[model samples]
Target: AQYEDGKQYTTLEKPVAGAPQVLEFFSFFCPHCYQFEEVLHISDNVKKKLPEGVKMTKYHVNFMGGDLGKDLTQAWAVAMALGVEDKVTVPLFEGVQKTQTIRSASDIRDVFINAGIKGEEYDAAWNSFVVKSLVAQQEKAAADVQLRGVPAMFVNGKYQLNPQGMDTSNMDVFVQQYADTVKYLSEK
Candidate 1:
């Protein structure tokens, strides 16, 4: 969807507190999210392109629920809390989706360590009550949206974007559509 008017995004009954929120539902173990990571530059591109005051948050969804999913969710919260999400995001994707080396929290911890996080620093963030609260909060947020898939985007916490509805079938086109949609919404 081109995100023109309201054709490409479904508007929510109640918008979130922020004027405009850009929330991405993703999972470290998702192949499509990994692809979006590279093509859309989920972390880098959004940081560079999103307008100021347009709040953005990344929520790790455990659609395929299990201990593994929970662990990664916690890891994501930890990464976000530690301010290392930008550093660890791509590596986490590469480690999990590319090399298949990440399978547990310990593996994720090592990945963070390799990304320049000290052991103690990681522990403090990973185990902090704030991180735990964030995990719970994000879990509830995902449930509220009834999130069923990876790489789903919510604009202003009010509209759910549909890139496929815009007739984008190729990965490259999909990324462009996503970026254009975010830019359009943020400007609004």
Candidate 2:
């Protein structure tokens, strides 16, 4: 999905002006996040009903709890920095969820290249300090955000979509309701 702001907004900055931002913190290796994507689609449709000046974006959180988490998270950050997230996220997720291959940086890169995101600029961007810092920040920020799992949401950096706190079989309805709740809270 496109960031919709039509500009490259880094995770390091506060949200863009005019619109309060809604961020989905997700990971490719996470099955829960994969399933949660459907709920987000529903929530996005609900976004059309929302008052103006609300923008949505997804942030690929690198899970740092395990070695696999670290590598996947770092690679995800690199994809974000390379500005190829829109190109890479779905394909990468599909590979992880569908294939039995070992998930790693090189595997991710291969999927990215096959998915039409290959270039020297992208290569350099993938290894840049910004991407590395983003990976580091996400790992550290998990503590402050009080996250224990994937598929979380942050609305204007306020309400957090806690997985453990939700009964997600009905997530479509629940998430749509939450969007309304956010608009209500924002106006207050």
Candidate 3:
């Protein structure tokens, strides 16, 4: 995973420096994203391999499922804030991509309520500064990158995963390579 300019990774226009950060920009409506998280489990594996003090952040981009995807990001922010990240992650994907079930934030709020959380409790987080800030920043970053695609990972806010010339015949091997690539760029 030696990063060559425009090869296995692409350097962003202007690098932003700070604490080592690994950012995964994904969409719930994306099948490959579902594969990465639910099928291949790449997200979890990458989180495991990130170096100490390196923050792993994810943003559910808005442009994927249209307005529904945008609203989903809002609910996702609240979901994470309410500590129901795991509970809502896969179901949201399945509903949006597989069964075509989830329609709007209300539908998602009911899903959250179904996950043993109270409906009123959900609204509190949904309206709270924590969730509002999360959604706003996520959308800000989402809009920052004029992305033509979903499921891109960035290291330290600029270096993006370019997977061209990557071995993917074996899922585990590909994950190891992907994880190492992010970890490598994160430390730079």
Candidate 4:
């Protein structure tokens, strides 16, 4: 089904300026998101098609656990802050979802250490005020968008691209739809 403006996507109550934004809401512990890693290669696939000036970001949802979840979220913030997402994000997901080997901040820090990040860099990024503030911003963005679940894509903060109930089975099909939706909305 072609995405109708109101049905497949909804305009944000408050829109953001600058380049069109694609924000992915996900959790490292989510099996579906793990599946996306295996099946969709979502970030790479979408990025190849993104027009110049379009920006994409991932927001780790803080839905459960004031402890474990918070730690994982902080780990993500640290990864982003230190520009180590390409190294740590996937390993974190695999460690948690596939291996069930990551249980605490120490475990996550170990993953980064294994990835060659020095102890000093890890300590600085993990404890930095910037990482903490980004985590707070992540929480507010999730709440602001009324995020319902993981693996959701919001384009330009105006369109929510969902696969379920969209009468599609192929990830590429949905990706195409999402990209097209963004192109259409961004030009206006």
Candidate 5:
């Protein structure tokens, strides 16, 4: 409960607007990020614990996949643009991490195809101004924050969580504390 600066959390230089919103920086290729979703369910639990009207957003990182980072994030943007984030994100994660079969844009395109997105619809968004802008925006967000790791979270862009001292051994304990810290950093 210390919540001391540089200990439990830190402040953002240009605190993001939209208080009570949680922004996460992660990459599809990151093992921890993948497990954080599938294994630990950290992302889902924290989301469930959040108060009403508060939402979590993400910035898919550009440094995690070497040259493939941008491509992966671009695919994420395409799914989001088409409003199928829920349908596409988890399957894509599984395909990349568990299946290890997703490599090129066409491989990614097939995911949307399975999700019921038309081939032309997927291609329409790919590399278009909208997809490029979103990819650029998230990449810039990561760069602007001087981000250093995957699965990082920020509250309202005002505070950054430092897991340096939190309990990590127990999922229930850690999730409660993590959600508590998220709420504390949100707007209080």
Candidate 6:
């Protein structure tokens, strides 16, 4: 899953700059991933509470499945390269989960359009090298890190489990605990 050297998305950041980045190792196809979207969205407070230099960046893992995950990962790469991912992550999350399905590239593109990306711009970005590079980069990051599960996580490049696995049945408790645990890890 590793990318060739010199790819733009190779490392999270050079020299592990700043406090270690908290990486959420997940797959777009993971049900848990979908389940956590709203919780993650609500926990803007969690981002606010991170240490001054520490931050969270999602490493969308796709090594587990076949092209299903791969395709979505590619789409994500495209979106990021086009500078539209930040604009559409939430809607993408909603579309995938609300529809209770893993959407195709066209479907994702439609959602992106609704989220503000122009049709031509979105199409061009979707076919850009940046997205393809990102897809390669994402695979490599997960492999380099030696991850085992979707939605597994890393705190400062070190693997971490929430101590309690995610339980979507009680979302408030699940989210509160996850946020608290991440905060605790940050303090260490």
TM-score of each: 0.84, 0.69, 0.90, 0.85, 0.88, 0.73
Kindly list the per-residue Cα lDDT of model 6 for residues 1-188, writing each as its tens digit.
22221221223333332323677666666667665665554235457667678766666766644665676677778776766656766676666666744446677777777887889987777788777777777777677666677666556654354524445577676666666666665665
**lDDT against the true structure, each candidate:** 0.77, 0.59, 0.80, 0.76, 0.79, 0.62
Which candidate should be chosen as best, given lDDT against the real structure?
3
Off by over 4 Å in 4: 12-20
Task: Give stretches of model 1 more than 4 Å off.
Answer: 1-7, 13-20, 46-48, 167-173
> Worst ten-residue run, lDDT, model 1?
1-10
Candidate 6: pairs in clash: none
> Which clashing pairs does model 2 show?
62-73
lDDT of 4 at 82: 84
Worst 10 residues of 6 by lDDT: 1-10
Q: In candidate 3, what are the lDDT values of residues 58-171, reduced to their tens digit?
A: 778877778888788888898778778889888888888888878877777777887888878888888899888999888777666666688888777778898655788998
For candidate 3, the TM-score is 0.90
Residues 31-141, candidate 5: write the lDDT tens digits.
878877777777787787788888887768878767667788888888778888878878888888889888877787888899999988989898689998988888777
Ten-residue stretch with the least lDDT total in model 3: 14-23
Least lDDT summed over 10 consecutive residues: which range in candidate 2? Answer: 3-12
Per-residue CA lDDT of model 1 for 12-103, tens digit only, reads: 67665543278888887788787767756754566567777667788898765477788889989998888887888888888887898988
Arrange candidates, best lDDT first.
3, 5, 1, 4, 6, 2
RMSD of each: 2.7, 8.3, 1.9, 2.6, 2.2, 8.5
- Cα miss at 159, model 4 (Å)? 1.7
